[PDB]
Structure formats: C-alpha cells, structure tokens
Design a protein around this ligand. Structure first.
Ligand code: MN
Length: 211
C-alpha cells in the first residue's frame, strides 16, 4: 500500500522546543521508539531501495496498573520518493511478539520462524530463500509527540543518533500539498525555523552525521 506523508525538518532544538510548547493543548500521546534495521552485508535491500525495519515502541503514558509488553512492528518500505517535503513509499507492516523481535536483532535468521506475510514478501519480491545472510545494522531512538491539530495528526520527532539530535514534523495524509501549506503557514506565523526534509531517518543514520 502507498503511504504519503509531509516531512519537514525543524532546524534547531530551540525551534523544536518552541513548537512542542505551542502544540501542548493539542497533545494526543507520546511514543518512545527504537528502530532497528536489517540487510545483507552487501546491502542487497538498500540497493533495491528497500528498507526492512523492526520498531520497538511504548506509549510514554501507558497504564502503571496494567503493564503490557512493548509492541514490535516489522515494516517493509519500498519504491521511496522524497522531494519537496513530501514522502511517498510503498509500505507493508505487521505486529509481532516482542520477545521474537528482540531475538531477531541478535539472530536475523530467526526472522523466518515468525510466519509473517511481510517477511514472506521480502523473500518473494527480492529473491531470498531465508534470512541466513542478514545482519542487524543496528539503529536509533526516537521520541514522537502526536498531536490532533486542525483536522490532522501531527508527529513531531526528536531523533537521538549517537552523533546528535535531529528534529522533524511529519503528517500522514492523502492531501499532502494542502496539509504541507497549512503546516508551513503556521510555522511561518510562529517563526519556527524549518525546511523540507530531504533524507529519511534511516538515511541520516547510515550517513553517520547530521544532515
Ligand atoms: Mn516518517
């Protein structure tokens, strides 16, 4: 399925602080995310412009009385385009058990035990019989604030790489040009410095430096 989202870079931590402060009345939830990625040592998926990700996440305000495991989501993203602050990608995602997700990080071959259609698709589309040749590339942490604002869900990200923090605003939408304009007018009015995001979080991770 084709996913579309507006993707804007917030240019400083101060801009990000100002934004999160202003959006506080619209706050829906806060997600703590850890993203991990998988490929062959020869970057077979990356060369076919495919990204295979296991995300571990928890709601920061999860009930203290009723604890639950962190959620684990496997996602395959393919045929990406990112230009003019609009990201388009073919995406397939599926939830899996926390414990098996964690074991796949240490042993990517175990990705076949899962019996996940997403991973069956990786095999069939890209010509793998199994994940015996895969490594975990590692990954990074993200704090995602979700807001319900002017009819859309805004996602404000603080991505914490080893080489420093990056800040983004995202919005999933079928009307990216209208929504992008709406967001930009707001940021402009509030003097929150921004630009188009021209790199995915994974690309920034792999570059090993701030964009
Ligand atoms: Mn995104």
């Amino acid at each position: 399925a084709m996913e579309v989202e507006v993707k804007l870079r917030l240019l400083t931590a101060a801009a990000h602080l100002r934004l999160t402060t202003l959006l506080t009345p619209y706050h829906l939830k806060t997600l703590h995310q850890r993203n991990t990625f998988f490929d062959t040592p020869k970057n077979d998926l990356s060369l076919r412009r495919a990204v295979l990700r296991l995300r571990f996440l928890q709601n920061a305000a999860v009930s203290a009385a009723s604890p639950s495991p962190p959620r684990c989501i496997v996602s395959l993203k393919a045929k990406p385009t990112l230009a003019n602050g609009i990201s388009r990608v073919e995406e397939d995602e599926e939830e899996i058990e926390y414990w098996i997700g964690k074991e796949c990080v240490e042993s990517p071959a175990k990705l076949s035990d899962i019996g996940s259609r997403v991973l069956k698709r990786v095999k069939e589309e890209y010509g793998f019989n199994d994940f015996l040749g895969f490594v975990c590339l590692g990954g990074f942490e993200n704090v995602r604030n979700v807001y319900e604002w002017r009819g859309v869900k805004l996602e404000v990200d603080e991505t914490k790489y080893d080489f420093g923090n990056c800040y983004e605003i995202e919005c999933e939408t079928e009307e990216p040009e209208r929504v992008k304009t709406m967001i930009e007018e707001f940021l402009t009015e509030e003097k929150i410095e921004f630009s188009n995001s021209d790199m995915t979080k994974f690309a920034v991770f792999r570059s090993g430096k701030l964009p």
